[PDB]
Each structure stands twice: as C-alpha cells, then as structure tokens.
Design a protein around this nucleic acid. Structure first.
Ligand SMILES: [Mg+2]
Ligand SMILES: [Mg+2]
Ligand SMILES: [Mg+2]
Ligand SMILES: [Mg+2]
Ligand SMILES: [Mg+2]
Ligand SMILES: [Mg+2]
Ligand SMILES: [Mg+2]
Ligand SMILES: [Mg+2]
Ligand SMILES: [Mg+2]
Ligand SMILES: [Mg+2]
Ligand SMILES: [Mg+2]
Ligand SMILES: [Mg+2]
Ligand SMILES: [Mg+2]
Lengths: 201, 190, 175, 139
RNA sequence: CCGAGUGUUACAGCCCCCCCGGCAGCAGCACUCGCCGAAUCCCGGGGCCGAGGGAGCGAGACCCGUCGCCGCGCUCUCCCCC
RNA sequence: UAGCUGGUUCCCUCCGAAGUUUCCCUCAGGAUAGCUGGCGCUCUCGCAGACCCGACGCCCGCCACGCAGUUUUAUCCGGUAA
RNA sequence: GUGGAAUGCGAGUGCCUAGUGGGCCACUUUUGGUAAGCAGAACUGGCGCUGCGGGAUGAACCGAACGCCGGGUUAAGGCGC
RNA sequence: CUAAGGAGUGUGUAACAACUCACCUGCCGAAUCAACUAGCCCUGAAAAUGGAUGGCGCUGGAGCGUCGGGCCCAUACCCGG
RNA sequence: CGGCCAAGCGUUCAUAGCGACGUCGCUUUUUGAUCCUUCGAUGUCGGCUCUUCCUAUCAUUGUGAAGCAGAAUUCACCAAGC
RNA sequence: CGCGGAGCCUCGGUUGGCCUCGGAUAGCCGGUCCCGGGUCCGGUGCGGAGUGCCCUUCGUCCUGGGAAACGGGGCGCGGCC
C-alpha cells in the first residue's frame, strides 16, 4: 500500500476526523484532506466563533510577531488540530506532519481521484439531528479568511465539469448493460461459474 | 417520557393544491404560490385524501421540545393556505400630536418615505420585503395599507416601518407618535 | 453494595435459641442482590432495622434464589422505594415493564442512579408488585398498553463505524 | 416515508448477536428498546431482543399480541415465510455473500478464468455498440 | 378500509382454578435464566526456557553407569482366532 | 580561644537510626536514658540414620521448655461519648 | 503427666559502643485563634533515609517498597489522538 | 319578590362617575389545577503579561450517573537463570 | 465591593430611588495575623519619564428604567475602543 | 536531443491498479413516455454494491475447438483537441 489516502472533508466533524488522520500519519500513510470548508463543528455557530476569537487574543504581548500564529484558512485551522494530536516537537512527529497535505477546495491533482469518507467522524453519524453545528468555511470567513468567494466560484466550476463526467460514465454503464443482453448465449457458460461462487446475485 | 406518536392533520380547501417535495410545502392557489422548506424539523409530511386532501404531520418518539414543533408546522401551513386564497392585509394608522407624518409611496409600493416625524429634517426611507406592496388608504385620513401573500413578510414590513418611527431621548409615555399596526386583516373578506 | 444484574432471593433467618425463647420466630425477606454472599448481608441490614436481631445472635436458615414464575409474559411492575438524597430522605413509587422481576429492579437501580444520582447503598427496595395495566399510573409505561401498537425505527444510526473505517460511500440511515 | 413498522407479527431479520442470521417474529413490545420475539420455525426460542439487533422485513403475520408458540408457528407455516424468504433479493444477497466466503483456492481460480473471459466478450461487444452509435451524420 | 363505542369467544386470543394429566427433552446442539466437579476426563495450538553433570552394593565392573524410585508389556504354561 | 561558618581524599558486602525523657546561667551545646552496631557467651531444637528406608515400644493416648504490639475464656479497672 | 484455651515463634544474657537530642506531614480525637501552607497536643502510619507504577507537573496522596535478567500475571490507575 | 349572587377583589374612588367580572344552564366538550421536593443546566459569578479538564479537542459523547465483557503495564506476585 | 429577606422612608405606595433587624459572599490596592523564601545583600518612600493591562464605567457610541413633560439629573445593560 | 554505450559513486524506500457526480439522511438510486421537468417502471439492509470493481505474470512447442475477423503491436511518424 503505497498510494495516498484522499479524504473528503465535507460533513466530517473537526476533531473526530483529526484523531483518525493523526493516527494514520504516524503509521506511514500519506493522506490528503480536501474540501476543508465543508468540515463541521458541533455546537451552534456563535459559540464556536467565540472560541476562535478567544484564541485570537492569545498573543505574546512583548512581541506578537513571535506569538501564536493564528492561521485563518479552513485548511490551516484543520492542520493545527491534527498537529495538536501529534508529537510535533520530536523528529517522528515532524516527519509525520509532512505526510499530511490539506487543501481548501479540491486542487487539480486530486479532483480526478475518488475520495474516501470516514463514517466514525460524520455529522450524520455522530450528532443527534436536533443539535446545532457550524461550518469551518463560514467561521473562517468571519475571522479573516480572504478567499471563500473565489473558492466557491472554483468549486461550482469543478462540479459542472464533474456532472459532465458522471453522465458520460453513466452513459457507458447502460451500454455495458445493453451488451450483456446482446451477448448472453455466448457468456451463459461463464455467468454460471460466477453465479455459483458468490458473484452475480 | 418520549411519546410514541403525535400527529396533527390540516384540512385543505379545494382552491389550493399543495404538493410535497420531501419537507417542502409548495402551496398554489388563486393569489399566486408559496414555498417553505421544513428541513430543520424531523417530521413526516403526507397528503392523505383523494377528494378532500388532508395533510398530516407525525413526530414518532419525540421529547417535549420536539413535540412542540408539530403544531407550528400546522400553523405555518395554515397561514400559507390563508395567504394564497385570502391574503394578508395590515392597516396601520399614523399617530401624531403636532407634526403630521407625511408618508409618500415610492416605486410601485416597494419603498415608503416618511418626512415630518416629530418635526425633523431627516427622511426615513424603508424598503418593503419582496412581495409586499404598500399603499396609502382612501378610507381614512392617514393609514397605510400594505398587503401580500406571505405573513412573515407582511408582518416584517410593518415592523420595519414601526421601528423606523421610534422616539429617542424623550419620555415615550408622552410623545406617542409613530405608525402603529392597527389591525391584521385579510383581502377577500369571506 | 454494587450491582451488575440482580437476582431475587428468599432469605429466611431466626434468632439463636436462648433458654428464654426456645423456638424463635422465622422471618423472611425478599432481597435483590448480585449474589448470595451479598444477599445474606442485606438480610441482616434490614432485619437489624426492624427486629432487635444481629447476625451474631442469628442464623440464615435458608437462602435460595427465586426464579421468575412466568419469564415470557410481559408484566408491569410497581416498585416502592426509599432513598437518601444530599438533603433528607424521600419516598417513591416507580413503574417499569420487564419480563422478570429482578430485571425490573435492576432497571430501577440504573434509573435511580441516572435521574437522581442515587447510589445503590442509598436505596431501600421495600415492596415490588406486579400491577395490572388498568392500575398503572405512569404514562411512560401506559403508552405501550395498546393492542395495535405500531411505530417505525426512524433514524438508524450506523454502529459499525470502523468496519470499514475508510470507505467511499456515505451511510444511509433510512430503513 | 416509513413503509416498515414495528408491530405484532412483523418479521425481522436478526443482524448480530448470538442469533445472527435468523428470521424471527415480533410478539410483543417492551419499553421502547426491546421486543418480545419468537422464531418457532427458525430455532429461536421466545425471548427479549433489542431493536438494534433486528432489521425489519416486509412480512407481517396475523396473530394477536402475546399468543403462545403454536399460534405463531401455524401463522408462520401458512403463507410460508421460509419460502417467501430465500426468494426475495435480500435473502439471495446473503446466500451469495457467504458462498463467496467459503470459496476455496481452486474455486477462486475457476472464477478468475471465467470472469477474465466473460469480460473479454462484453468489452468486445461495447466496442461495436459505441462505434455503431458513432455512425450518425445528421445536422 | 380505518377510527370510536359495545361487551365476555363467537368467524382471534390472553389469565386463573383444576378431578386428574400424558409424552419428549432437561440447567438443552432451539446461545431463555445458575452453581459446581473424588459429583472430571480427553485432545490440540502459541510463547519463553534446558540450570545440573561419576546416579553402578552389582560383576570383583574394562568400547560404553540407557541407572534409582514409579507405572507398565512379554517369556520361562497351553490352546485358538485374523 | 571559638557551644559558630566552611571543607574532610579508594571500592564492594552486611546491619541500620534519632530530633524524645530527666538535669544543666540550659534554648545554635552537653551530660542522661532510649534508638544503633560490633564482640561474644549460655542453652534449645537438633543434624539424622552409606544407596536403601516413617517408625520399632508401654488394645489406648502422647510428642519439650519458654515466649507474643494477637485473639479466646474467666475476672477486675475507668466516668469519656451519649 | 491427658504438659490442663487458640495461633505463631528458638530463646536467654553480658560487654563495648557510634550517630542523634532543629523534625515535618496525613486520617481520626483535640486546644488557642475570624482564619492561615498558623501556633500547640494525643493515636497510628508516613516523609526525613526511598527508588518504582499512578495523581499532566509535586518530600508527604493511592498502589507497591528495590540484587542483575527472561517469561507470565496483576495493583492503584486507565483505554478518541 | 333567587336558576346562583356584592353592605367588595374588580373602571385608584368628597363624585347619580360608569362599564356587565364574580355565579351559571345551554355553546365550545376532555382531563386539569396548585403547593412542594431534588436531579442536570442556567442566573447569582468582578483583576490586572496571553492561557490552560495537562493539551488538542469532544455534544447518537471523548460530559454526568449506574453497570457488563474485554484489554493495557510496576522494580509487586509467580516460574526459571 | 456586591447579594438575599423586607420593618420602614419615599405626600399615596416595601422594592423609581432607597433599606433597619438579620444573614450570604467576592476581592487582595489596606492593615493586622503568620514566619514559608532571601542576612557570603533582591538598592528601601515619593515625584519625573514611558509602555501595557484590569473593570468594579467618570465621559463618549448603542440601549433599558424613573417619583423620565422639555432641560438637567439619577438607576441598570453591552462595552475598557478612545 | 538519445537510453546511445560503458562503468562507477551515493541516498534509500517500495513489492499490482481504481481515471472524478452532486448530495440527501424523517429518505435515496436507476431506467422511461410526453412538455431540464411531470408521468411511468424498477431497486433500496445500497449488488449499477469500495463488505465493491479492474488487471492477473510459469515459459514455450506440437496441435484441435470456441472468442474473434470492425482486430493486435509499435518510446512508428504526422496532425488535431
Ligand atoms: Mg491582517
Ligand atoms: Mg430628557
Ligand atoms: Mg551555641
Ligand atoms: Mg546551624
Ligand atoms: Mg476526666
Ligand atoms: Mg455530652
Ligand atoms: Mg536531616
Ligand atoms: Mg488507604
Ligand atoms: Mg409607606
Ligand atoms: Mg513553624
Ligand atoms: Mg546585587
Ligand atoms: Mg537587581
Ligand atoms: Mg462591566
């Protein structure tokens, strides 16, 4: 297993996804998290905004250019939660944290690869539906992220190129199903062997 | 305590033919059409009849707080049905002690402007919601007559122009001036 | 006294025969306990509070387990208890539905700890009775008294959240 | 929404626990979580089960609540549940899923050769069907 | 076809008492709920380890203590069977 | 001169504290008894019967003294808690 | 001599003798004080003299006391990262 | 002199100021009201470098209560050198 | 420096503003109380200069209350930007 | 520009691929007749399924029968997008 692990960020809770990622990165396993604006945080929006604004006040008052670096993109907010779950003062955790690539939106190395989903970190699995939650993309916008408008215009452009891919992929799927009815007197021998051993219900 | 089932049905007249796209009620009547989604509430909506067309809504294992959202959905659906057959109409009087409040309606009932409130020079300009048309009455001397399909837009537009005429830094037990909602009626009085 | 799942016991005791009372009266209690070592010592706890009887001047004549006389019929159980709070002590009447009697009492110990933070040493079960459906008081029990009971399983949450852990498809919850 | 309901006579499919894989019938309901439950013809004696173990089917038997064993047995046997099951697609998916698991090293070889041939014909046929759909010359 | 009444088995069933039950199984291989083994035995798998070094009461030991205790099998009887 | 500071040089092995009593122009010290170590000594059980081997005297029954931050059984004592 | 309750244990005795005579903490009882990480007692254990596991960190808490190692299993405490 | 009724709660009162509560049998026709009590949560809840369930974080729980099965390792226990 | 209770004050009227007899807290700019750290030394009051922080808000922005007609004023809230 | 060759030096990991809908979750997916829709037909413990799918590697020679014949192979050239 030498490939990378591509996780869609949308619908996942922030710290449930982060403990999943941080244990994989320490076990080898290159992993890319794309679409970090879709990451959710439980609790209502105003509550989670206050916890970020309370973080924005911790600065070294002698020289705040040395202080806590308050990263404001959703990809770099997620990158610090998984860093907090890593032993990043050692060489092992620094060599971990560069097996992790985080992205806002889905850049053109990873837009043509199929994304994975971690069900133990999803909002529809881990929250009761009558609980309030927030979005990492919205919350980063009110704390100073410059680019949710340009990232939204590039995600709607990616999706309409992806609709065209799907309805052509699905157009081949009904030609393959059309073929299986054309050739069935010459593959009835092989569809009996597959049906005997648990393939082809 | 979580109640196994709490339902409430809504009668639909023959003028209106509502549909259900999941938890979105599209009510369509003679005065136009309306649309709200209730996808912040976990209920099941279902049309029942074939000749009378009731609308039920069920909750299934709700606690006390969840059990309150059932009759609110029924009340919002009934204000949709009243809104597309009768429609909503708010008459609001302008109360003044000395300085006559001059309201003149700007472009096609979408903007009102209020000139002389407590004898001052700043001109209030308050925009209606999309769909609400305001007017100056002819039945009385000074009441606004604003009307529309959706109740939360007609009522919001009366609330904007009532909070536009607030007295500041004075006692408001004298100085009772402003425009206040006088009645909440309907068009096409049945 | 901890818990874990309770059993009913029929514990019978009597004072040691002095040369004053040659045959002392046999007393019995019904005592819910994890096992019979704990059951014999709840006996002397309660019987010291009632009769002037300690376990030094006494003997457990019989201590046996009561089995449920109809463990397949669904029953309604009235429970009278008495428990100590952070403030003074209080009386209660609770109700449950269970197949076994000690199942209903176990269900009460979990529930008194849940709603009241009552630890098991603070609770004294003083009478437990099977109630007819007509005599029930608690509306959380009585809503199941319906010959046409019908309800769906609305929002099924995924339980196998790590088999698989990384997957390509998002879970369905409507079933 | 909500076609399948927990009720008396509803046939469920036990998904995990010790009785995993057995059809069973809901006899009575307890306290929102558990159900009195009996499989007379599937070797599950009458007992209590949590609803999270069981998965509802489309089959409903007709008997009143808390009947004895013999009245759910004979309601099972007429309108035969054991043969309506193993005719649905859902019991066929289970049957296929375990016979893929009990597939030896030689049967994986015979499937490998068969599927490699079977995908040659189908792939050859879709080359012809999409070059014949390519023969279109209309404005 | 659902809902509400009605009342006592009817075109379902449930509870109790018997005047008495019969059979099977039996803490069940129908994973409903125990405690055990002089009332208990058999077989297998994984792991770590090999410390010590003249044990012969018998021949008068000789290439060479396969020796003590313990548990067994055969032969110094005879017959039969495969 | 200093009842006061500071320093006081190799290794392993075994044993292992006290800041409390009483007296002192005694209160940053000593004497005193406790607590520690060392050196022993006086006895006891006895060693155990070459490999062996529970035994070898008188139907029973018995297996040395002493000792203890302990209980039991007797029996006194006390004026706290309530 | 039936060695006169149970249980455990080898005991007795002498000489010489160093260091110490600033202690501190905790449960329960307790005195002065509004109290104090305060001052003063009783009882036992501890720290001082003592590492190790746990309480993120810590003289004193909880578990358990230490020759140099292998295997196994626990205690208190834990088991998202 | 009623089908049940003010020497007033009720239009704050030197005013015949003046309006229909109280008590109802038909309407609306099924349960409801009150006083307590104690769980969690909230208000009560204000200090100075920027900051602390240890941190990240966590809300079908990684919170609180009562519980089960597994499991993790001390120089402790066990077997061995 | 705040809270709770409510006899009273407030022409009437407990609670606009108050608040006796009680009682519950917070804070560490006071001083007591203590003696843990420093006596082989931590330069010891104030002013001057200069920065930052706190809020228990004097003013200013946005509000709520009055025994708020206007004016002035008092009481609270968000708030330490200036 | 070549793999064009010849050898070295040094750093090591690794042991088949997955080439893409958007989302919903108190609902989804897939086909279809009439103006991206309405109809209609299916599926739904997802089988048009990541609990999945695709590639499969002993090499050859004799030799047949199927699949094929619109094919295979070229770091083939040339052009286009
Ligand atoms: Mg900036
Ligand atoms: Mg003013
Ligand atoms: Mg001195
Ligand atoms: Mg000194
Ligand atoms: Mg005395
Ligand atoms: Mg006393
Ligand atoms: Mg010392
Ligand atoms: Mg202890
Ligand atoms: Mg007064
Ligand atoms: Mg002191
Ligand atoms: Mg100096
Ligand atoms: Mg200095
Ligand atoms: Mg403030």
């Amino acid at each position: 297993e030498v490939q990378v692990l591509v996780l869609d960020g949308r619908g996942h809770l922030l710290g449930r996804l982060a403990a999943i990622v941080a244990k994989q990165v320490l076990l080898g396993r290159k992993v890319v998290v794309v679409r970090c604006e879709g990451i959710n945080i439980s609790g209502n929006f105003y509550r989670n905004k206050l916890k970020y604004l309370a973080f924005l006040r911790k600065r070294m008052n002698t020289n705040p250019s040395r202080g806590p670096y308050h990263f404001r993109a959703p990809s770099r907010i997620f990158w610090r939660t998984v860093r907090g779950m890593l032993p990043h003062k050692t060489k092992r955790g620094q060599a971990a944290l560069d097996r992790l690539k985080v992205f806002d939106g889905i850049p053109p190395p990873y837009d043509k690869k199929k994304r994975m989903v971690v069900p133990a970190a999803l909002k529809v699995v881990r929250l009761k539906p009558t609980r309030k939650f927030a979005y990492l993309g919205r919350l980063a916008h009110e704390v100073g992220w410059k680019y949710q408008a340009v990232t939204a215009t590039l995600e709607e452009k990616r999706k309409e190129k992806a609709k065209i891919h799907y309805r052509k992929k699905k157009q081949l799927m009904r030609l393959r199903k059309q073929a299986e009815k054309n050739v069935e007197k010459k593959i009835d021998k092989y569809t009996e062997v597959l049906k005997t051993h648990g393939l082809l219900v | 305590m979580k109640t196994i089932l709490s339902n409430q049905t809504v009668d639909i007249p023959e003028n209106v033919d509502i549909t259900l796209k999941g938890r979105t009620v599209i009510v369509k009547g003679p005065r136009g059409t309306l649309r709200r989604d209730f996808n912040h509430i976990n209920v099941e909506l279902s049309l029942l009849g074939k000749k009378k067309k009731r609308l039920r809504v069920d909750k299934w294992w709700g606690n006390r707080k969840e059990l309150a959202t059932v009759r609110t959905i029924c009340s919002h659906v009934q204000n949709m049905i009243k809104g597309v057959t009768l429609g909503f109409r708010y008459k609001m009087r302008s109360v003044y002690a000395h300085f006559p409040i001059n309201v003149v309606i700007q472009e096609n009932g979408s903007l009102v402007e209020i000139r002389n409130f407590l004898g001052e020079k700043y001109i209030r300009r308050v925009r209606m919601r999309p769909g609400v048309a305001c007017s100056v009455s002819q039945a009385q001397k000074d009441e606004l007559i604003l009307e529309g399909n959706d109740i939360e837009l007609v009522s919001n537009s009366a609330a904007l122009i009532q909070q536009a005429t607030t007295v500041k830094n004075k006692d408001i037990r004298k100085f009772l001036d402003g425009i206040y909602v006088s009645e909440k009626g309907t068009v096409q009085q049945a | 006294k901890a818990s874990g799942t309770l059993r009913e016991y029929k514990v019978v005791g009597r004072c040691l025969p002095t040369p004053k009372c040659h045959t002392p009266p046999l007393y019995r209690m019904r005592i819910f306990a994890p096992n019979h070592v704990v059951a014999k010592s709840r006996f002397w706890y309660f019987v010291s509070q009632l009769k002037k009887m300690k376990k030094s001047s006494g003997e457990i004549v019989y201590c046996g387990q009561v089995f449920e006389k109809s463990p397949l019929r669904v029953k309604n159980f009235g429970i009278w208890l008495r428990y100590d709070s952070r403030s003074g002590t209080h009386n209660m009447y609770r109700e449950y539905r269970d197949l076994t009697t000690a199942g209903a009492v176990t269900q009460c110990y979990r529930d008194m700890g849940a709603r009241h933070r009552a630890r098991a040493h603070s609770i004294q079960i003083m009478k437990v009775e099977e109630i007819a459906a007509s005599k029930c008081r608690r509306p959380a029990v009585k809503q199941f008294h319906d010959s046409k009971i019908k309800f769906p399983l609305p929002h099924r949450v995924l339980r196998r959240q790590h088999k698989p852990r990384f997957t390509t498809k998002r879970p369905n919850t409507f079933f | 929404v909500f076609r399948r309901f927990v009720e008396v006579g509803r046939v469920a499919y036990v998904s995990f626990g010790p009785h995993a894989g057995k059809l069973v019938a809901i006899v009575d309901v307890i306290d929102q979580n558990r159900a009195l439950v009996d499989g007379p013809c599937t070797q599950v004696r009458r007992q209590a089960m949590p609803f999270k173990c069981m998965q509802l089917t489309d089959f409903i038997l007709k008997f009143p609540h808390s009947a004895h064993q013999k009245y759910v047995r004979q309601a099972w046997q007429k309108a035969d549940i054991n043969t309506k099951w193993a005719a649905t697609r859902w019991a066929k998916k289970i049957e296929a899923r375990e016979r893929k698991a009990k597939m030896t090293d030689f049967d994986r070889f015979k499937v490998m050769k068969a599927k490699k041939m079977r995908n040659r014909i189908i792939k050859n046929e879709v080359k012809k069907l999409q070059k014949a759909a390519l023969l279109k010359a209309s404005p």
